[PDB]
Design a protein around this ligand. Structure first.
Ligand code: A7T
Ligand code: NAG
Ligand code: NAG
Length: 337
């Protein structure tokens, strides 16, 4: 029973400003997993005990042991995800998942097949998709949908705070926002359509001049992405405008110049969201002989979602983000650290 004022929160660990994860329990008694909570996908994945020790990504992560949960219920429906370095596959199962003290009976994918890269470099063990049912593999009801159907949470919204690496690493609130991690007020932008946390963008400004995305473009708000990302060509333009020169997959500046780079502005719902140099350069060193990388990368996202920009941890660290299902909209407020 609720009296209409209940929320719950999940505390996150920050790994290298690139991976932000919380812990959830699966089964009875609970088996614990480190998971990334990801607004750009809608399925729950964890590695299965039936994953072969010939898969290097399985060898060094927590595996889910179905035989040890009294509440597990067999399903077996094969599941497939194309990933750009190979195919990940596994089977469907059902059990009880515990998140922020809430218990939910949930379908999830047990992974039995995984490329070694990039998955062996994950600090976390799995993924909890916070996207819409419309994009769920095998159309299974996502975890937040199940949570809502309980009618326990104050509002049909969840929010994300991501800290700079140092101190709380981040926090997800289910059913509200935490006024301690943001300042001032929320502005909201409506979603282009239901089924994806994607909004319209009206311009990207270096300095005081709109250098990109006039005539508009799309922005995916992806809590699971490490960086702000754009199309190859867009990023070329932005980088050649910054003095940044291409390494292998990175763009680099001289660590002494970094602190004098220009602001980048994102124009979203008639408000300008500005990142300064301190927000987008990894300043490992303030030295004239060293090379510093930028938290902005190139990426070309396939249809139907793309071509699109993606506003990942780099953008979220600056702006506390509220994801509003009741009104199909996203709100931003300046985060406080
Ligand atoms: C160790 C391990 C790692 C993972 Cl990702 C896992 O889940 C298997 C499901 O596969 C994926 C699920 C989601 C994603 C997504 C994303 C994605 O790239 N992810 C993987 C990721 C992110 C950062 C750093 C590393 C090393 C990795 C592996 C997962 C969200 C964390 C991003 C970017 N693209 C769109 C969405 C979806 N958001 C990519 C792969 C399992 Cl079962 C085990
Ligand atoms: C909801 O609970 C919070 C607990 O911090 C309390 O401060 C607030 O007054 C409550 N609001 C309502 C609607 O009663
Ligand atoms: C799980 O698989 C069962 C067979 O055991 C299938 O009939 C069912 O649709 C699956 N659950 C869902 C809701 O996808």
């Amino acid at each position: 029973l609720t009296l209409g004022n209940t929320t719950s929160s999940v505390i996150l660990t920050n790994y290298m400003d690139t991976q932000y994860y919380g812990e959830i329990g699966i089964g009875t008694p609970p088996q614990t997993f480190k998971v990334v909570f990801d607004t750009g996908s809608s399925n729950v994945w964890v590695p299965s005990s039936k994953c072969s020790r010939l898969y290097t990504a399985c060898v060094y992560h927590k595996l889910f042991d179905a035989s040890d949960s009294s509440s597990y219920k067999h399903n077996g429906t094969e599941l497939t995800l194309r990933y750009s370095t190979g195919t990940v596959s596994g089977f469907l199962s059902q059990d009880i998942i515990t998140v922020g003290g809430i218990t939910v009976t949930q379908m999830f994918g047990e992974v039995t097949e995984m490329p070694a890269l990039p998955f062996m470099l994950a600090e976390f063990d799995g993924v909890v998709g916070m996207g819409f049912i419309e994009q769920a593999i095998g159309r299974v009801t996502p975890i937040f949908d199940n949570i809502i159907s309980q009618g326990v949470l104050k509002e049909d919204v969840f929010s994300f705070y991501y800290n700079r690496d140092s101190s709380l690493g981040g926090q997800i609130v289910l059913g509200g926002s935490d006024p301690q991690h943001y300042e001032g007020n929320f502005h909201y932008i409506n979603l282009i359509k239901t089924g994806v946390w994607q909004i319209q963008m009206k311009g990207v400004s270096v300095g005081s001049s709109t250098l990109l995305c006039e005539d508009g473009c799309l922005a995916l708000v992806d809590t699971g992405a490490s960086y702000i990302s754009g199309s190859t060509s867009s990023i070329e333009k932005l980088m050649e405008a910054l003095g940044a020169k291409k390494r292998l997959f990175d763009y680099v500046v001289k660590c002494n110049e970094g602190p004098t780079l220009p602001d980048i502005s994102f124009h979203l719902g008639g408000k300008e969201y500005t990142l300064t140099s301190a927000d987008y350069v990894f300043q490992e060193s303030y030295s004239s002989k060293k090379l510093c990388t930028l938290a902005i990368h190139a990426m070309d996202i396939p249809p139907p979602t793309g071509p699109t920009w993606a506003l990942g941890a780099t953008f979220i660290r600056k702006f506390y983000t509220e994801f509003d299902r009741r009104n199909n909209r996203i709100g931003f407020a300046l985060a406080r650290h």
